[PDB]
Symmetry: C3
């Protein structure tokens, strides 16, 4: 595979956006986990449907609203994707990650990512929030990488590092902030593993993922962190633990799609609240001062 967007494609899109809103957000938020309520916290909210934005791919998967929203979250101006793209929809990674590069051209400096993942770590309970410390990019092992093809120097270098992808200063901020929240449960932190999807894992597969050191498993986020880190954005994200995966053959077995219970309800509301507060801690001036 190879990139199909030219540097100008991204520029035309950013210029289109800049000519349709006076808002200039410094933070971008990609909400994977059904957190519609996050958009409900936005002040001076303005929305754009993916279909009306030049060069913007369309969302298909259910629960994904499919719209870019600009607004003020806790005194901080931001832009957020209400629903993301996944390779399992048939989308190549350079399409899945198209918006991340447009964000960089809008002047955004920090990218927050969220998703819903299956807990692999035995100590995780449903509804747990997991600060992403590191990831394992399985699709990347086989060569399926959003940066495949000729490198765009105007975005970044050919061989970028990923060992420091999840901002450490912001992780310290997340922990302190969680404490202030007066939460009974502790803030988890671990390694997120990504695979293609769309089917759910088998017991054998879950065991393999865990033995490799994975703490949670999902079908997204990683490609966006790669591209964001490649073009220089500060990154940090969370995984809403919507379920504990089956590790024994004799049990409930069939991993159904009840993730919709935690999404929108239960822990999602706490995650949204958590995200709003974090906006204040985020570096750079914009949040009032």
């Amino acid at each position: 595979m190879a990139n199909g967007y030219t540097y100008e494609d991204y520029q035309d899109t950013a210029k289109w956006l800049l000519s349709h809103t006076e808002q200039r957000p410094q933070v971008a938020v990609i909400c994977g986990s059904g957190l519609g309520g996050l958009v409900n916290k936005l002040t001076q909210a303005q929305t754009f449907d993916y279909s009306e934005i030049p060069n913007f791919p369309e969302s298909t998967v259910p629960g994904h609203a499919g719209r870019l929203v600009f607004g003020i979250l806790n005194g901080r101006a931001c832009v957020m994707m209400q629903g993301r793209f996944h390779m399992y929809e048939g989308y190549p990674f350079w399409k899945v990650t198209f918006p991340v590069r447009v964000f960089r051209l809008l002047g955004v400096e920090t990218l927050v990512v969220t998703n819903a993942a299956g807990g692999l770590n035995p100590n995780f309970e449903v509804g747990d929030i997991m600060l992403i410390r590191d990831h394992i990019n399985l699709p990347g092992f086989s060569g399926e990488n959003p940066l495949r093809g000729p490198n765009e120097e105007r975005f970044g270098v050919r061989f970028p590092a990923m060992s420091d992808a999840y901002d450490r200063d912001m992780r310290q901020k997340a922990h302190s902030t969680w404490k202030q929240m007066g939460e009974q449960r502790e803030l988890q932190e671990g390694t997120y593993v990504m695979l293609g999807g769309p089917n759910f894992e088998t017991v054998a597969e879950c065991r393999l993922l865990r033995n490799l050191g994975a703490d949670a498993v999902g079908m997204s986020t990683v490609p966006e962190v790669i591209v964001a880190r490649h073009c220089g954005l500060r990154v940090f994200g969370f995984s809403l633990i919507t379920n504990k995966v089956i590790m024994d053959t004799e049990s409930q077995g069939k991993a159904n799609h009840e993730e919709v219970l935690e999404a929108g309800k239960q822990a999602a509301q706490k995650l949204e609240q958590f995200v709003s507060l974090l906006m204040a801690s985020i570096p750079v001036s914009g949040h009032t001062g």
Copy 2:
């Protein structure tokens, strides 16, 4: 990648078949392991060459006859593919799995799968038959999955479970049946791991596969089980252990293609016999009653 067959494509193919045979099989059998003799057990046998069936891909790999056969196996009406498709032939998974969906449209409810695999478990001896308990879909980790692209609702859901892909009731049946066979060797059971191929594994690779928990390794079957489970077919299969893989650097080394000795001869004959008897145990009315 993305699916290239429209729901109608499958329908035209099933209707073509239904208009060329009065037989209405409830069980489909995909024979990977050189088990020509299985077709030799069919009563009222009728054959179709892949090339003459609309929308049907062609078989290339040697030993694969390349023909769909309808017939009566031990009083049970079934349809079986004499030879399957593999990704290493250049075929995308949605082509490799095309026949499984046609089977569902013919009214088939149970899919039996067989293949030849290299034994990774140290307790396996050449000629061993291994009931497939679970699998590890390596190509799937990288995103190469037969369900990639827009989901066809008329076939199944977007996020199907795989943790229960190999029917448990039929596995109990397999064990009991094997006992009745009066066999000296016990019926093995384990996790099958699939990789792309066509080359054979290296020692280092075999060690890796085994450490991950794999019991046998092959270059097929998994994509068919995915699609079959996605559209609702009951699935269960076997792996004829045609060889014990090299795990030490100083030995015979070079993994030649002598799988042809066990295939057609040795354990294949026992596997065919085993499959015929199983037909009676299979659920639903058709086998006499």
Copy 3:
């Protein structure tokens, strides 16, 4: 994916070369590690730019000169690629490996491969030279293999073995030769693991690679060894350990691209010297006798 070159494509290219130089090399060398000095040791050197050779892909990655050079190395006639192709450039494997098959058509019998890799084994020090004993082809697990598609019988068999890819006689030669060199450090030997690239690994990923048994990690070589072994060439190669990878979260972290220090300088000069001497030990008559 599937091969796009016909057997004739390779033949036209070999015949073009044979009609532009009187040299008939028995050994081919693919230099991945910045070892320009190797070309500096060639007597009766003659060069061809990739762009001027029919059907020859172009090199993009920096440090890769992008030219085929024929010459006499330590009394042995050879042809060497000054810079190789990588999948991360957007190149499919059948293009990446195109030159290996042309080499076979020129009458070449031994292929030497070199690259720069990150040390995973804790006992490896920067500047270490590692004889490649075996490899783990990660892209191959997902099906991305240079041999994918219809097999060319005129080159080799459908299911080739890889368990003996790195010539053992030549490995014994390498060790003895190293001893004669009077080196303080011992010649390392291990398993090379390949992944797609272009980004560098994260700590979590490095830990995973190592736990799997990998000794060094890189983004090349493996596809060339596959194709070379498929068409019958004797293969053996080395990995210049340009760095020790981060295995702990609190450290220098960011894996920068300082590989350029060891390349051309430091250990590269020793590797070139090592390669020149090896030419004498290589089987078949040409080196004087």
